[PDB]
Design an enzyme around this catalytic site. Structure first.
Site, PDB file in Angstrom:
ATOM      1  CG  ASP A  96      23.209  13.688  -6.670  1.00 48.64           C
ATOM      2  OD1 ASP A  96      23.651  12.808  -5.894  1.00 48.64           O
ATOM      3  OD2 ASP A  96      22.044  14.151  -6.539  1.00 48.64           O
ATOM      4  CG  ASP A 142      22.563  14.065  -2.609  1.00 48.72           C
ATOM      5  OD1 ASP A 142      21.880  14.695  -3.442  1.00 48.72           O
ATOM      6  OD2 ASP A 142      22.977  12.884  -2.755  1.00 48.72           O
ATOM      7  CG  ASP A 184      20.319  17.450  -5.456  1.00 52.39           C
ATOM      8  OD1 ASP A 184      20.146  18.220  -6.406  1.00 52.39           O
ATOM      9  OD2 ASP A 184      20.070  16.228  -5.525  1.00 52.39           O
TER      10      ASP A 184
HETATM   11  N1  LIG Z   1      17.052  15.710  -6.083  1.00 51.34           N
HETATM   12  C1  LIG Z   1      16.447  15.013  -5.090  1.00 51.34           C
HETATM   13  N2  LIG Z   1      15.100  15.037  -4.913  1.00 51.34           N
HETATM   14  C2  LIG Z   1      14.489  14.345  -3.921  1.00 51.34           C
HETATM   15  N3  LIG Z   1      15.165  13.577  -3.036  1.00 51.34           N
HETATM   16  C3  LIG Z   1      16.522  13.459  -3.099  1.00 51.34           C
HETATM   17  C4  LIG Z   1      17.252  14.186  -4.159  1.00 51.34           C
HETATM   18  N4  LIG Z   1      18.558  13.905  -4.008  1.00 51.34           N
HETATM   19  C5  LIG Z   1      18.663  13.073  -2.938  1.00 51.34           C
HETATM   20  N5  LIG Z   1      17.449  12.798  -2.394  1.00 51.34           N
HETATM   21  C6  LIG Z   1      17.169  11.924  -1.210  1.00 51.34           C
HETATM   22  C7  LIG Z   1      16.341  10.685  -1.552  1.00 51.34           C
HETATM   23  C8  LIG Z   1      17.212   9.477  -1.235  1.00 51.34           C
HETATM   24  O1  LIG Z   1      16.694   8.682  -0.162  1.00 51.34           O
HETATM   25  C9  LIG Z   1      18.568  10.060  -0.866  1.00 51.34           C
HETATM   26  C10 LIG Z   1      19.579   9.850  -1.978  1.00 51.34           C
HETATM   27  O2  LIG Z   1      19.116  10.359  -3.235  1.00 51.34           O
HETATM   28  P1  LIG Z   1      20.042  10.367  -4.561  1.00 51.34           P
HETATM   29  O3  LIG Z   1      21.029  11.520  -4.536  1.00 51.34           O
HETATM   30  O4  LIG Z   1      19.147  10.324  -5.760  1.00 51.34           O
HETATM   31  O5  LIG Z   1      20.759   8.912  -4.507  1.00 51.34           O
HETATM   32  P2  LIG Z   1      22.087   8.474  -3.691  1.00 51.34           P
HETATM   33  O6  LIG Z   1      22.812   9.718  -3.249  1.00 51.34           O
HETATM   34  O7  LIG Z   1      21.692   7.429  -2.680  1.00 51.34           O
HETATM   35  O8  LIG Z   1      22.909   7.734  -4.867  1.00 51.34           O
HETATM   36  P3  LIG Z   1      23.848   8.509  -5.934  1.00 51.34           P
HETATM   37  O9  LIG Z   1      25.236   8.307  -5.381  1.00 51.34           O
HETATM   38  O10 LIG Z   1      23.639   7.838  -7.266  1.00 51.34           O
HETATM   39  O11 LIG Z   1      23.362   9.943  -5.932  1.00 51.34           O
HETATM   40  O12 LIG Z   1      18.392  11.455  -0.637  1.00 51.34           O
HETATM   41 MN   LIG Z   2      23.095  11.511  -4.420  1.00 53.15          MN
HETATM   42 MN   LIG Z   3      20.595  14.174  -5.068  1.00 52.32          MN
END
Ligand SMILES: Nc1ncnc2c1ncn2[C@H]1C[C@H](O)[C@@H](COP(=O)(O)OP(=O)(O)OP(=O)(O)O)O1
Ligand SMILES: [Mn+2]
Ligand SMILES: [Mn+2]
Length: 332
Positions: free
Chosen positions: A194, A196, A256
């Site tokens: 995803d 963020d 997100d």
């Molecule tokens: N949907 C969510 N709900 C809760 N916390 C989140 C979410 N998305 C991100 N976070 C927070 C928790 C983590 O410490 C950090 C990264 O989450 P996440 O997006 O799941 O993984 P990532 O960005 O490190 O790897 P990836 O590249 O696979 O997304 O930000």
């Molecule tokens: Mn992510």
């Molecule tokens: Mn995320």
């Protein structure tokens, strides 16, 4: 000597032990699927140690005196070095329980508890889920509708395109508001599951009502396939599937969007930048070694009933007595 806590050592994006760390992380993931949180953390920690080593592990003698390398993790590495394969890892890979839990938990809106419930109820395939739509939330239905795209790794090029449209919408809704890329892409990752973003405004309170205006703009441009907005109960957020245009086609991509008031922004950025293990370790370090409670909103002294005022991530590291690690060294 290598420090015991992941937040006390740099962990770069690329390393010399990818086969070994991958095998340990399969066992960590499988443990999580069975509710074995102790064993998950143990295998995760061992894998993270390998990511921090400056050289490949070619012989088992290179394990001696490393932290978090108990008997089980050492055995896994030994079998890989000696035989090119670990039989326990291969059994896990081949098992229907693991494959199915991986399949279900990968779907947008599905956690381990849901996936396990579905497994126990006899569901195995994506078609099985589509045959039982009454068992699905609207978020999960959306995840299933776009499953192929959502399983396709998000690329840095997709991230750049998405950041442009999010910045345009934020800038048109509220001049001066900012968009910061977080998650794995801020840590330098080339791919991800995803994208963020963290949104704020330098004047506390000016961010109020910004996110719905941003979503309206994006929706009007045809860029949104799915949107679930949630007010703070704890940051205001929107968990989305974007329709990303590409030449002659388009791709669904999870995004997100999180809004933080600027007073909490350094904590939010730190929390949302990860990695997941890095943050777990940083929060454990804070509680165990410093008596402080760290989360994505602040740093609290439970004995004094005080909050730490930080302007930056650097401020937070300093307050905890840790050398600063930039995002690209938090790949624990
Ligand atoms: N949907 C969510 N709900 C809760 N916390 C989140 C979410 N998305 C991100 N976070 C927070 C928790 C983590 O410490 C950090 C990264 O989450 P996440 O997006 O799941 O993984 P990532 O960005 O490190 O790897 P990836 O590249 O696979 O997304 O930000
Ligand atoms: Mn992510
Ligand atoms: Mn995320």
């Amino acid at each position: 000597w290598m420090p015991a806590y992941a937040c006390q050592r740099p962990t770069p994006l690329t390393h010399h032990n990818t086969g070994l760390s991958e095998a340990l992380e399969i066992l960590a993931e499988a443990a999580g699927f069975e509710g074995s949180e102790g064993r998950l953390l143990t295998f995760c920690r061992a894998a993270s140690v390998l990511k921090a080593l400056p050289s490949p592990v070619t012989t088992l003698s290179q394990l001696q005196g490393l932290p978090h390398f108990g008997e089980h993790s050492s055995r896994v590495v030994q079998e890989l070095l000696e035989h090119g394969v670990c039989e326990e890892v291969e059994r896990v890979r081949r098992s229907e329980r693991y494959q199915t839990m991986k399949l279900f938990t990968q779907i947008f809106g599905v956690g381990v508890k849901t996936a396990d419930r579905w497994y126990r109820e006899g569901l195995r395939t994506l078609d099985d889920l589509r045959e039982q739509p009454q068992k699905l939330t609207q978020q999960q239905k959306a995840g299933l509708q776009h499953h192929q795209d959502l399983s396709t790794p998000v690329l840095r090029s997709d991230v750049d395109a998405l950041q442009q449209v999010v910045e345009e919408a934020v800038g048109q809704a509220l001049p001066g508001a900012t968009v910061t890329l977080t998650g794995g892409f801020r840590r330098g990752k080339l791919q991800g599951h995803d994208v963020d973003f963290l949104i704020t405004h330098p004047k506390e309170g000016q961010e109020a009502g910004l996110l719905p205006r941003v979503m309206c703009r994006l929706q009007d441009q045809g860029l949104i396939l799915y949107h679930q907005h949630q007010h703070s109960c704890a940051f205001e957020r929107s968990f989305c599937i974007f329709r990303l245009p590409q030449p002659g086609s388009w791709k669904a991509v999870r995004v997100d969007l999180v809004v933080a008031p600027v007073s909490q922004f350094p904590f939010a950025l730190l929390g949302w930048t990860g990695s997941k293990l890095f943050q777990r370790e940083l929060r454990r370090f804070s509680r165990k070694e410093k008596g402080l409670w760290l989360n994505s909103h602040g740093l609290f002294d439970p004995e004094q009933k005080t909050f730490f005022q930080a302007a930056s991530e650097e401020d937070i590291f300093r307050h905890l007595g840790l050398e600063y690690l930039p995002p690209e060294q938090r790949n624990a």
